[PDB]
Design an enzyme around this catalytic site. Sequence first.
Site, short mmCIF file in Angstrom:
data_model
loop_
_atom_site.label_atom_id
_atom_site.label_comp_id
_atom_site.label_asym_id
_atom_site.label_seq_id
_atom_site.Cartn_x
_atom_site.Cartn_y
_atom_site.Cartn_z
N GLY A 191 0.84 -1.20 0.00
CA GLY A 191 0.00 0.00 0.00
C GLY A 191 0.87 1.24 0.00
N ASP A 192 0.32 2.35 0.48
CA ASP A 192 0.91 3.71 0.40
C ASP A 192 0.85 4.31 1.81
OD1 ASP A 192 1.62 6.35 -0.10
OD2 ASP A 192 0.44 6.51 -1.97
N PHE A 193 2.01 4.59 2.43
CA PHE A 193 2.11 5.13 3.82
C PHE A 193 1.68 6.60 3.87
CE2 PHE A 193 6.98 4.91 3.00
CZ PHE A 193 7.02 6.10 2.30
N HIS A 206 14.15 10.51 5.40
CA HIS A 206 15.20 11.29 4.69
C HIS A 206 14.96 11.27 3.17
CE1 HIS A 206 18.57 8.14 3.71
NE2 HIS A 206 17.35 7.58 3.59
N1 LIG Z 1 4.30 5.32 -0.75
C1 LIG Z 1 5.07 4.39 -0.20
N2 LIG Z 1 4.50 3.49 0.64
C2 LIG Z 1 5.28 2.55 1.19
N3 LIG Z 1 6.58 2.33 1.03
C3 LIG Z 1 7.12 3.23 0.18
C4 LIG Z 1 6.45 4.26 -0.46
N4 LIG Z 1 7.33 4.97 -1.26
C5 LIG Z 1 8.48 4.37 -1.10
N5 LIG Z 1 8.43 3.31 -0.23
C6 LIG Z 1 9.52 2.44 0.15
O1 LIG Z 1 10.33 3.09 1.10
C7 LIG Z 1 11.64 2.48 1.09
C8 LIG Z 1 12.68 3.54 1.31
S1 LIG Z 1 14.38 2.91 1.29
C9 LIG Z 1 14.52 2.12 2.91
C10 LIG Z 1 14.31 0.60 2.82
C11 LIG Z 1 14.56 -0.14 4.14
N6 LIG Z 1 13.80 0.47 5.27
C12 LIG Z 1 16.06 -0.14 4.46
O2 LIG Z 1 16.50 0.65 5.30
O3 LIG Z 1 16.86 -0.92 3.91
C13 LIG Z 1 11.75 1.73 -0.25
O4 LIG Z 1 11.85 0.32 -0.07
C14 LIG Z 1 10.46 2.11 -1.00
O5 LIG Z 1 9.93 1.07 -1.79
C1 LIG Z 2 27.30 8.11 0.89
C2 LIG Z 2 25.80 8.18 1.17
C3 LIG Z 2 25.00 7.26 0.24
C4 LIG Z 2 23.64 6.98 0.89
C5 LIG Z 2 22.96 5.79 0.23
C6 LIG Z 2 21.48 6.12 -0.04
O1 LIG Z 2 21.18 7.18 -0.59
N1 LIG Z 2 20.60 5.21 0.39
C7 LIG Z 2 19.29 5.37 0.17
C8 LIG Z 2 18.68 5.51 -1.01
S1 LIG Z 2 19.12 5.64 -2.68
S2 LIG Z 2 17.15 5.84 -3.41
C9 LIG Z 2 16.45 5.75 -1.85
C10 LIG Z 2 17.32 5.59 -0.80
N2 LIG Z 2 17.14 5.48 0.52
C11 LIG Z 2 18.33 5.34 1.09
O2 LIG Z 2 18.49 5.22 2.30
#
Ligand SMILES: Nc1ncnc2c1ncn2[C@@H]1O[C@H](CSCC[C@H](N)C(=O)O)[C@@H](O)[C@H]1O
Ligand SMILES: CCCCCC(=O)Nc1c2sscc-2[nH]c1=O
Lengths: 341, 341
Positions: B224-226, B244
């Site tokens: 879904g969509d957060f 972030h």
């Molecule tokens: N509208 C939305 N609803 C739910 N998840 C979403 C979203 N838009 C992006 N995301 C998800 O948010 C994640 C951000 S990246 C972080 C991924 C994971 N928590 C980690 O730390 O490794 C991605 O996997 C992306 O698919």
């Molecule tokens: C040297 C810093 C590089 C940081 C890596 C980075 O940006 N990770 C990352 C990405 S890339 S697209 C969405 C996400 N979310 C994240 O946490």
Amino acid sequence: AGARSLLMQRLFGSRVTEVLAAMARLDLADAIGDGIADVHDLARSCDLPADGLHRLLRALAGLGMCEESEPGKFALTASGALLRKDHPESVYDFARFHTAPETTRPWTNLEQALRTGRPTFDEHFGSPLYEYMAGHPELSARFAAAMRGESLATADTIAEHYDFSPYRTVTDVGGGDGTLITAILRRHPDLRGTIFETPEIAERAAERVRAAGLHDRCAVVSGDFFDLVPGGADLYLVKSTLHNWDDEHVVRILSSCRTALADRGRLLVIDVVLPDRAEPDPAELNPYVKDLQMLVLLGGRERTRAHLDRLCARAGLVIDRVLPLPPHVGLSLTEVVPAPA
Amino acid sequence: RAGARSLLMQRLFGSRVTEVLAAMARLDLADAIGDGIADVHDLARSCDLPADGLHRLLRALAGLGMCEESEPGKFALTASGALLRKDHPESVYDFARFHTAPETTRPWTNLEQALRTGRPTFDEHFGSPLYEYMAGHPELSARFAAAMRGESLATADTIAEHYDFSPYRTVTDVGGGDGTLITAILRRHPDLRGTIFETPEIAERAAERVRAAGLHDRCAVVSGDFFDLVPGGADLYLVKSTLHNWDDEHVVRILSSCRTALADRGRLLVIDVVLPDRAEPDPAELNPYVKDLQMLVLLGGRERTRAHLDRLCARAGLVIDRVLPLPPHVGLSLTEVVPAP
Ligand SMILES: Nc1ncnc2c1ncn2[C@@H]1O[C@H](CSCC[C@H](N)C(=O)O)[C@@H](O)[C@H]1O
Ligand SMILES: CCCCCC(=O)Nc1c2sscc-2[nH]c1=O
Ligand SMILES: Nc1ncnc2c1ncn2[C@@H]1O[C@H](CSCC[C@H](N)C(=O)O)[C@@H](O)[C@H]1O
Ligand SMILES: CCCCCC(=O)Nc1c2sscc-2[nH]c1=O
Ligand SMILES: [Cl-]
Ligand code: NA
């Protein structure tokens, strides 16, 4: 923690470079200068919003180039200070040259250079690097100040680590803007010098020799070291030059140097000497990164002692001896002399 | 003087170091070398490169700590190099490929424009917002899922030792990727139940990981969509490396969805960079200011201070209860967030 951290350091280098390239291009070191500069003042100095420039400066502070003394107020570190045009040891032109498209775009095709063994520069810009630079005065002047920036480490140390007392005359073959020879002449007042360079780089050498007050002790001449190097000097220097050229071209240069040494002359090759087994190196500039830069820009390479001695043998020359410089410089002094037979 | 210069030279030549690593990853050299010592002539056939060309790349890789030349022409992986093997349980191969791909690197070629506009450069280069693009490109989506797993391993390995999960029966990871974080938590806490909440495309990767892990009986996958909602009823909510990705208005909406789901007895754990008020060097494996600029150029997101996050929580009806650290090499913090009075 250490094994992973190191790989993360290597992978995120290109993004670090873009942060540094922005600092140099925006001339932020000069804008900040000696003291503490407000980000709101800096923003108007290079047509950026405060938020955006604040985020770039926070990054530069995290990479050790600046210090955030108070929120939004930044000063240069010793490292950031070296990007000032007015720094006596400025690496500003070095930073601009090595982040310019002319030196970076050929690295996008590193793979093709490894496959062909030929430089990628030519196909991107329409000619070999030196023909291009001969035709682009702004870049040639940038190049001259860049090689000065790089060579300061070697220039400052070479007098302590080589004995110049036995020689009356020295010729620097591809001596650049005369950064090396002027350092040597300033410490050896009885010594006379010549810089041998391309037409374009020789005009830079002339004004450096004048500004160094060495007009009466250092000649500046243009010519081609694929022609004959002028004879009769006791010592010939060739620094950061042989690595610019493939093996066949290095033989021709060494051959021209051999005719000039005649009986009594000595050649001093100032360049990286690669070990037979490659390992991490304490030099300020990585010798294997230098190797691959030489490949992509010029089709050159760094060489082992054994490799250079083989090229010497084809030119009627032999390596007498190899002297070290301080570990941080990453260049060695290879003494080369004529082959009896 | 020496140190200041050396650090600057390190920063300037990062992009060339990254091209050597990118070449190693693209050519699958870590896999081709494997457990043992491999001869350059064998590796040359495995990736269609001439021997001299490959030897120079491997010598550069030896110089940068990714392998060792034991005998001339004979190479083994280091601890660092072995993390680029696909068969490594803690592989960063996909992470390496993703962050050296045009999709993450081309936006950095216009860093300046992103600083000027405050908007991502990705959209102009590829034609849509990053998450839209990846929803419509299955190969980059699968790579991205595997990339974030690679990044999240350092948090996953340490999160149990630095946070008490025992008080909670259920855990929901909001934007929990391929499930890397929650499968680590469930493996260490046998009585815990988990849910991964993700986009439809990434949720397929999470269901695949959960089944391969034998965790299907106490880990569910929901898509879904957060911005619309987060699945309710859980004791602990996680949102790692997600806030972030978004501007302040979007973070507030995500945190409003979390607030609804928390109800009374729910708790939220924001796992993200906490920037200090004053930017300084950081021992983290990934530089948090370079993270900041990556978020800008790809998504128009940003890294945030504690106080900034706290006022974003306020606009969502949440307050920061406390901030807990992870080991300094991780570079993320655990921010406990609870409903406001
Ligand atoms: N509208 C939305 N609803 C739910 N998840 C979403 C979203 N838009 C992006 N995301 C998800 O948010 C994640 C951000 S990246 C972080 C991924 C994971 N928590 C980690 O730390 O490794 C991605 O996997 C992306 O698919
Ligand atoms: C040297 C810093 C590089 C940081 C890596 C980075 O940006 N990770 C990352 C990405 S890339 S697209 C969405 C996400 N979310 C994240 O946490
Ligand atoms: N055919 C040629 N004849 C003479 N000099 C040449 C040449 N081709 C290139 N050069 C010069 O070779 C130099 C190589 S770079 C090294 C410059 C200087 N020795 C230093 O170490 O800082 C350049 O200055 C370039 O102008
Ligand atoms: C880490 C890599 C540093 C590379 C320094 C470099 O390229 N030096 C260089 C160049 S660029 S064009 C002609 C030359 N002659 C040189 O000696
Ligand atoms: Cl005179
Ligand atoms: Na001479």
